[PDB]
Every structure is written in structure tokens, then in C-alpha cells.
Design a protein around this ligand. Structure first.
Ligand SMILES: O=c1cc[nH]c(=O)[nH]1
Ligand code: SF4
Length: 206
């Protein structure tokens, strides 16, 4: 059941966000500061789904406000997408993290399939409320939530996909997680930014 009994019967994003603040669908609400719901409105045509809020998002109350969000904005700017058409959210709404003794920043830990399934009711409520025409799936965790734990982003990135079990049959475009463009060789990162831009353009023209 997970978060099912915490999701209210409303398509109002402010009421959904307030309700996600009391959610006990899985254990992640305990160590996290607050629930991080999605930003943007119901007029949005493009829904973007990341994995989970990070350290800044957990204290800011908004998705993608740290370094990966800065990189995503640079790629949206280059793909000619304004955020006025964007509902931006994550698969899990509570920061899963550990503290590295002698490190800078709380380090994010990969949500389990159990926690992604527990949180999925909020993503179904968001998609039912926004009725997007295209869902951009940022990374493996988000793509698996809608396409199955077998899905590989590396084998299908930039492809317009359509699965029947998803609300409203929106077009789906799976791409690299923006944090991947902050790690590695300068040319792998430049090719990967160029692929995120291409994947965002495919989604913008659906
Ligand atoms: O909102 C955010 C921030 C960082 N990484 C994500 O997956 N989502
Ligand atoms: S991560 Fe999702 S399911 Fe788990 S407590 Fe937070 S809102 Fe509820």
C-alpha cells in the first residue's frame, strides 16, 4: 500500500504537497527535514521526474535547486524549453541520506525499489493532476518507476516511448540524470550534456 492512504482524493497540487508533508508511506520521512513535492503548475505540458531531493532541496522545499538543477537549467535553456511549461518532481519525495564523517554535504543514497513503489502513488496523483503530454525521466530510478526495474536508460535514451499502464498515455523520454554531467572526463560530460539537450528537444516536440 505504501503512500496510498496518505494521498487525498484531490488533483490540487498545494493540497497534494501539504498531504505529502504528513506521509508515512515508507521510512524516509523520519530523517528528512520535510517532503519535497514538485514545482510548477497543472497547465504544464512537460513533466520531469528525477530520483529524489538532495541536501539543498531537503532544506529548500523545492526540487533541483542545487548543482544538478543548475546543469538541468543550462540544458533546458539550450533546448529552448522555459520552466513555465514544466512540472518538475522526483520518484521519492523524502531525502534518503548518510553522513560521511569528514565529508562536505549529506550524501544521497539510492532509493530501493520498495521506496519508489511506496512513493509512486504521489507521482500517479501528480500525472493525473498535470495531465502531461510528455514525461521526461531523468535517470535510472525515475525510468524504472514507470518502465520497470529491468529498463536500461543507456539502451533507450532519446526514444519516444508509450506504455499502456501509465495514466493518460503520455509520451515518455528517458535520459541521463543531470548529476552524471558533473562527474567524469570533460568530453564524456560534454557529449552527455549534448545528449540531454537532444533528449529534451525530442520531448519538447512531442
Ligand atoms: O530534485 C532533485 C535534485 C537532485 N537530484 C534529483 O534527482 N532531484
Ligand atoms: S518518500 Fe514518499 S512514500 Fe516515503 S514517506 Fe516520503 S512521501 Fe511517503
Amino acid at each position: 500500500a505504501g503512500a496510498q492512504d496518505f494521498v487525498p482524493h484531490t488533483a490540487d497540487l498545494a493540497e497534494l504537497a501539504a498531504a505529502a508533508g504528513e506521509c508515512r508511506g515508507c521510512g524516509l520521512y523520519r530523517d528528512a527535514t520535510q517532503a519535497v513535492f514538485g514545482a510548477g503548475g497543472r497547465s504544464a505540458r512537460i513533466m520531469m521526474i528525477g530520483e529524489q531531493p538532495g541536501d539543498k532541496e531537503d532544506l529548500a522545499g523545492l526540487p533541483f535547486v542545487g548543482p544538478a538543477g543548475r546543469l538541468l537549467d543550462r540544458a533546458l535553456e539550450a533546448a529552448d524549453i522555459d520552466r513555465d511549461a514544466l512540472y518538475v518532481t522526483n520518484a521519492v519525495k523524502h531525502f534518503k541520506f548518510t553522513r560521511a564523517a569528514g565529508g562536505k554535504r549529506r550524501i544521497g543514497k539510492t532509493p530501493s525499489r520498495t521506496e519508489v513503489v511506496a512513493c509512486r502513488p504521489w507521482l500517479i496523483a501528480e500525472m493525473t493532476s498535470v495531465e502531461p503530454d510528455v514525461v521526461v525521466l531523468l535517470g535510472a530510478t525515475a525510468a524504472k518507476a514507470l518502465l520497470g526495474n529491468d529498463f536500461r536508460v543507456t539502451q533507450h535514451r532519446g526514444e519516444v516511448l508509450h506504455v499502456d499502464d501509465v495514466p493518460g498515455d503520455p509520451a515518455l523520454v528517458a535520459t541521463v540524470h543531470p548529476s552524471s554531467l558533473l562527474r567524469g572526463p570533460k568530453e564524456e560530460r560534454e557529449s552527455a550534456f549534448a545528449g540531454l539537450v537532444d533528449d529534451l528537444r525530442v520531448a519538447a516536440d512531442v
